[PDB]
Design a protein around this ligand. Structure first.
Ligand SMILES: Nc1ncnc2c1ncn2[C@@H]1O[C@H](COP(=O)(O)OP(=O)(O)O)[C@@H](O)[C@H]1O
Ligand SMILES: Nc1ncnc2c1ncn2[C@@H]1O[C@H](COP(=O)(O)OP(=O)(O)O)[C@@H](O)[C@H]1O
Ligand SMILES: [Mg+2]
Ligand SMILES: [Mg+2]
Lengths: 646, 505
C-alpha cells in the first residue's frame, strides 16, 4: 500500500470521522463539566518509627472515635431526580443547601439486604418540613424534637429553598468507617523523619477539613493521654468498677433466665430506650473527658450539654410511652432493658479499660501538629484537560479503526482498471444523476447524458461489421441500470435522425411502458403467445422519437415464451425497418432470458454498478454468456461518483 | 530514491522553507525578548538529619509567619493593556514604578468563584490617586488613611509617573502561601552535612532577597525558642528565560516543520513532471512549451519569445510527422479544460502562416470558444450558423489582422452542439476547405468532459493531445488516448505545455 491511498480514504470518510470525534468530545465535555468536584485537604504531623503509627492511624478505633464525635453516620444527600441534576445545578450557580442534624434514629427495618434505613425529608419552608419513610407522611418543625412511629429526629438550621428534598440515611457504623478509610491516606514523605502527611479527599470543602482536624486531635489526645494517666486514679477506678458491673450483668442474665423459664411496639420502644441509654453513657464519658481536657465555655462542651438535654427529653418521652403500655409486656421490657443496658455498659467499660491501657503503654512522648488540616480550593478530580484529551484521542482512534474496517471490507468495483485487468473493455462510465421520465429528455444537458453520448459515439464504431443492427443491454444483478442506460441511449441515438426501436424483453418486472406513457394492451407477451400481430405492439414515445414495445401482461412462462420462433421473426422484420434495435433484458445471474435473447443480438453489452457489483460477478456473467453461445462485446460501468482515493 | 531528488526538492522549495523558518525564529525572538525575567536568590543554612528540617521548612506555619510579617497577601501589579506591554516597556528603558502598601482591606465580595477582591488605582500625581472597584471612583491621598464604603487602604511612598495604573488584589492567605511555596525549594547538597541550600525564584530582585531572608530568620528564631552561613543574595543574571536555547529551539522547529511540509507536498503531487513519464507509456511527446511571462497572439505581439521558439520546433516536428497522412487536417485536443488547446492551436497557426503557407483555423469549441475575441471579430455567421444551415460557406471565413491565416469562429452558442457536429455539412465544409488551403487546424473541447473531439476526429488526418505540465496526470492522458481509440480516432501523440524549470529535474 501507499500513503496516497490512506490519505484519500481519510478525505473520503472525513464526515464520519468528524462526526464520531465530535460526539466523543461532546460526551467528554459533558462528563468533565458535570462530574462532582472532589477537593483534597491535608495536614502535617510531627512524630517525636512512623510505620506502626501509619498502621494505627487507619485503625478502626481512631476513625470510629472521630465518627462518633462528628456523627458521620447520618448521611444527608441533596436530591436531584436525574444522574446529571447536581452538575447542572452547580453550573447554573444554584447554591446547595444543608441541614445540621444532631440526633437521628430510624426504626431499623434491617431486612436481609438493606441494612441501611433511610427517609426522605421535603422542605416546606424555613421552619417546618415533611418526612416520608415508606409513604407515611409526617410533619416536623426545626427545633422541637420528633419522636413518632419509632423514629427519633432532631433538625437544626435548615438552609435551602422550600420545595427541596433530601435523602437521610442512617448507615451502619462499620460502613461509615469503611467510607472514611477509603478516601483517607497517610504517608511519611521522609521514610525516617517524624513528618507524616495526612490526606483526605471529599466533596465538601469544609466538612473534610473538620474531619481531618478531628482525626488529628483524636490521635494527639490518644497519644498524650499517657502523661495524664500514669498517676490518674481512673485505672484503679475501672479495675474496681468492672467486676461490679460484671456481677450485675450476671445477675440480670440469671433473672432473665428465671423469668423466661414479642410485641413489635414493645421491642421498638425497647430498642429506642437502649439507644438512648447508650448515647447517654457515652456522652457522660465524653463530657468527663472534655471537661478534663477542654473548658466548659468551649463550644464542644455546650454541644455535649445540649445533646444531653435532648437525650433526656427523648428518654422522658420514651418513659411516658412505656407508661402507656400494658404491664404484662412492660415486665419483659424492663428485664430486657436491664440485660441490654448491662451488656452495653459492660462493653463500654471494657473499651474504657482497653483505651486506658493503650494510652498508658504509649511510647511517643508528645506527637505535635505542625500543620492543621487545610483544603486546596482547586479540585483534584475530575481533571478536565486530560479527560478532554482522552476523549478526542479515543474518538480519533475509533474513527480510524472503523474507516480501516470499512476499507478492508469493501469488494465492489472502484475504477474501470479492475475490469480492464481481466480483459473486459469498459466502454463508458456513467456518473450518478442528481436530477418517471427520461433523463435524456427532461434534462438533456446533464452529465450522465453527456457520458451516454460518449457511449453512443463509442458504439457507432464498435457496432460496425456486426452481423445485424441489434444491441442487447444486460447485466449481472437487478437494479444495476439496464433500463436506464438502454432507454437513455435509445433517446440519444433517436435525436440524431436515426430511427430507433426499443424492446423491453424484461417479461418479469419491466416498467418501460410506465416511464414512456403507455397503452399497456398488446405488449410483447401478447405477441409471443400468438394472440396479437406485429403492428399493434409498437407505440411512440411522446418526448422521445423512438418506437417501443412494452412487455405487456406478465406471463407464467417467460423463458419458455422467448424460445418461440416468432421472436426471431419479429427481430428479423424489425431489422429491415429500423436503423437500430435495443433490447433490454433481465439479469443473467438471476434468470436465463438474456442468454436466450443473445443469440439474435448482433452486439451485447453488460452493465456493472459502481459499488454494488464485483469483478467476480462480472466475470461469472461473461463466462455464463460464453457457455450459452453469446459473445459479449464489453462492459459499461454505471453509478460513478467522484472519490478522492482514486 | 536518491539524494539528488531531495536536494532538488529542497532547492525548489527554498522560498517556503526560508519563510517558515524566518517566521518561527521571529516568534522565538519576540518571546525571548518579551518574557519577564525571573531572578533567583539563594541562601545557605548550617544544621547543627536534615530530612525533617527539609519537610518543616516548607510547612504552612513558617511560610504563613513570613507572609504575615511581609504582607505578601497584597498583590500589586503594574498595568499594561496588552500581553506584551511589560516587555516593550522594559525594552524601552522605562523604569517600573512601585507602591508601598502597609494596610489593605476590601469589602470581600466573596462570590462563588472570585474569592480574591481587587481594585484599580490610577496615579494622578506624586501625592493623590484614584480608586475604582466596580466603577465607583474615589480620590485618595498618600499619607492619610482611607476608610470608605467598607474599604480600608493605606499608601506610602508611591513612585511612578502620573497616569500609571495598578491592580491591587487582596488574595487569600492560603493562595499566597501556595504561590510562595511553588517557587521556593530546599536541598541538602551533601545528604549528610548540616548544609542546606535554599532557593527562591521571582521577578523582583530585592523582594525575593527580603522574602528569603525573612524565611531564614523565622526558621532560626523558631528553632532557637542552627546557623545562617550565607544570607540570601540574588543572582543578577536571570535564570529564565534562557534566550539562546529558545532561539535554537525555534530555528530547529522551523526547519523541522518546513522539511515535513515539503515532504508532504512532494509525496502528494501527481501531475506530470517530464516527458519521460508520458514516453514510458508509449506516447510520443512532440514538444514542451514553456510558460510565457509576456487578448492578442503571442506569436504576433512578441515573436521572439521562448514559447514561440518551442512552437516553431513543434512546427518543424509536424512538417515531418504530418507526411503520408490521409489529408491536411490537424486536430488539437486535450484532457481537461484550460490546458492550452486554443493557445497552442492559434500560435501554431500563426507560425505556420508566416512561412507563406495558407492556414485555416476552425474553432469547433461550440461551448466556450473565444477565438473571435482574440482575433478581432465579426461575430455574425460563426460555425453554428453554418452547421444549422442558415449560412453559406463564404460568410463564415474571416481574416486575422496581425496573423495571415483565415479563421471560422464558433458563432452563437447552440443548444445541441454534439448533435450539430454530426451533420454531414461539417464533412462537406472540411472537404471543401482541404482543396483551398494548405493546412486546417481544428480546436476542440476536452475529451474527458464532452464528446465533440471524438466526433470531429473522424475527419482529422492528424490528432494531437495537449497535456498541462503540473495539472494533468499520466492517468488522465492515458484515459483520453483510450477513449479516442474506442471512438475510432488514432492519436498521433502528446504536447506538453506550461513547462517551468525545476531544479529537481
Ligand atoms: N446513472 C444513474 N443515475 C441516476 N439514477 C440511475 C442511474 N442508473 C440507474 N438509475 C436509477 O436507479 C433505478 C434502477 O435502474 P433500472 O435500470 O431501472 O433497474 P434494472 O437495472 O434492474 O433494470 C432506476 O430507478 C434508475 O432510474
Ligand atoms: N505556454 C502558455 N504560456 C502562457 N499562457 C498560456 C500558455 N498556454 C495557455 N496559456 C494561457 O492560459 C489560458 C488557458 O489556455 P486556453 O487554450 O485558451 O484554454 P483551453 O485549453 O481550455 O482551450 C489561456 O488564457 C492562455 O492564454
Ligand atoms: Mg430493467
Ligand atoms: Mg479552447
Amino acid at each position: 500500500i501507499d500513503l496516497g491511498r490512506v490519505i484519500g480514504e481519510l478525505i473520503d470518510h472525513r464526515k464520519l470521522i468528524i462526526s464520531i470525534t465530535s460526539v466523543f468530545t461532546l460526551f467528554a465535555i459533558l462528563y468533565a463539566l458535570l462530574a462532582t468536584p472532589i477537593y483534597e485537604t491535608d495536614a502535617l504531623i510531627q512524630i517525636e518509627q512512623s510505620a506502626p503509627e501509619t498502621a494505627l492511624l487507619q485503625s478502626r478505633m481512631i476513625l470510629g472515635k472521630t465518627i462518633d464525635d462528628l456523627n458521620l453516620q447520618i448521611q444527608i444527600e441533596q436530591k436531584y431526580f436525574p444522574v446529571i441534576g447536581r452538575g447542572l445545578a452547580r453550573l447554573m450557580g444554584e447554591k446547595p443547601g444543608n441541614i445540621d442534624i444532631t440526633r437521628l434514629y430510624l426504626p431499623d427495618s434491617d431486612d436481609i439486604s438493606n441494612n441501611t434505613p433511610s427517609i426522605i425529608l421535603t422542605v416546606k419552608d424555613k421552619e417546618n418540613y415533611s418526612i416520608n419513610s415508606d409513604g407515611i407522611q409526617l410533619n416536623g418543625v426545626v427545633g422541637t424534637l420528633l419522636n413518632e412511629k419509632g423514629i427519633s429526629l432532631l433538625v437544626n438550621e435548615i438552609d435551602a429553598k422550600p420545595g427541596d428534598q433530601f435523602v437521610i440515611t442512617q448507615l451502619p457504623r462499620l460502613k461509615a468507617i469503611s467510607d472514611l478509610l477509603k478516601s483517607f491516606s497517610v504517608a511519611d514523605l521522609g521514610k525516617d523523619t517524624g513528618m507524616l502527611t495526612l490526606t483526605l479527599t471529599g466533596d465538601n470543602p469544609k466538612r473534610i477539613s473538620h474531619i481531618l482536624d478531628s482525626i488529628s486531635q483524636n490521635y494527639l489526645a490518644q497519644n498524650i493521654a499517657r502523661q495524664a494517666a500514669q498517676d490518674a486514679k481512673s485505672l484503679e477506678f475501672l479495675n474496681q468498677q468492672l467486676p461490679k458491673v460484671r456481677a450485675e450483668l450476671d445477675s440480670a442474665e440469671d433473672k432473665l433466665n428465671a423469668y423466661r423459664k414479642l410485641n413489635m411496639e414493645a421491642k421498638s420502644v425497647l430498642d429506642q430506650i437502649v439507644n438512648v441509654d447508650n448515647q447517654l453513657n457515652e456522652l457522660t464519658f465524653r463530657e468527663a473527658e472534655v471537661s478534663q481536657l477542654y473548658t466548659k465555655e468551649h463550644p464542644t462542651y455546650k454541644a455535649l450539654m445540649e445533646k444531653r438535654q435532648t437525650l433526656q427529653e427523648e428518654k422522658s418521652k420514651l418513659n411516658k410511652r412505656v407508661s402507656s403500655m400494658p404491664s404484662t409486656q412492660q415486665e419483659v421490657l424492663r428485664l430486657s432493658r436491664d440485660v441490654e443496658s448491662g451488656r452495653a455498659v459492660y462493653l463500654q467499660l471494657l473499651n474504657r479499660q482497653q483505651e486506658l491501657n493503650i494510652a498508658k503503654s504509649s511510647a511517643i512522648g508528645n506527637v505535635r501538629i505542625i500543620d492543621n488540616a487545610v483544603t486546596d480550593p482547586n479540585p483534584v478530580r475530575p481533571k478536565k484537560t486530560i479527560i478532554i484529551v482522552i476523549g478526542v484521542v479515543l474518538g480519533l482512534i475509533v474513527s480510524v479503526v472503523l474507516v480501516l474496517f470499512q476499507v478492508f471490507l469493501r469488494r465492489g468495483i472502484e475504477s474501470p482498471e479492475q475490469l480492464e485487468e481481466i480483459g473486459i473493455n469498459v466502454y463508458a462510465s456513467i456518473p450518478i444523476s442528481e436530477w418517471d421520465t427520461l433523463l435524456a429528455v427532461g434534462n438533456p444537458a446533464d452529465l450522465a447524458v453527456e457520458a451516454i453520448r460518449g457511449l453512443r459515439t463509442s458504439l457507432h464504431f464498435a457496432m460496425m461489421e456486426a452481423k445485424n443492427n441489434v444491441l442487447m443491454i444486460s447485466g449481472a444483478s437487478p437494479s444495476a441500470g439496464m433500463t436506464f442506460i438502454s432507454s437513455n441511449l435509445a433517446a440519444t441515438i433517436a435525436i440524431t435522425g436515426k430511427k430507433v426501436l426499443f424492446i423491453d424483453a424484461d417479461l418479469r418486472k419491466g416498467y418501460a411502458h410506465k416511464m414512456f406513457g403507455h397503452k399497456n394492451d398488446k405488449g410483447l407477451s401478447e405477441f409471443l403467445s400468438g394472440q396479437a400481430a406485429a403492428e399493434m405492439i409498437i407505440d411512440k414515445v411522446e418526448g422521445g422519437g423512438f418506437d417501443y414495445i412494452g412487455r405487456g401482461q406478465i406471463p407464467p412462462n417467460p423463458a419458455e415464451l422467448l424460445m418461440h420462433p416468432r421472436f426471431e421473426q419479429l427481430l428479423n422484420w424489425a431489422s429491415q425497418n429500423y436503423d437500430l434495435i435495443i433490447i433490454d433484458t433481465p439479469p443473467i445471474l438471476a434468470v436465463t432470458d438474456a442468454a436466450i435473447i443473445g443469440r439474435y443480438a448482433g452486439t451485447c453489452l453488460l452493465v456493472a454498478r459502481f459499488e454494488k457489483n464485483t469483478v467476480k460477478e462480472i466475470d461469472v456473467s461473461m463466462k455464463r454468456f460464453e457457455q450459452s453461445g453469446v459473445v459479449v462485446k464489453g462492459c459499461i460501468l454505471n453509478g460513478v461518483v467522484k472519490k478522492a482515493s482514486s
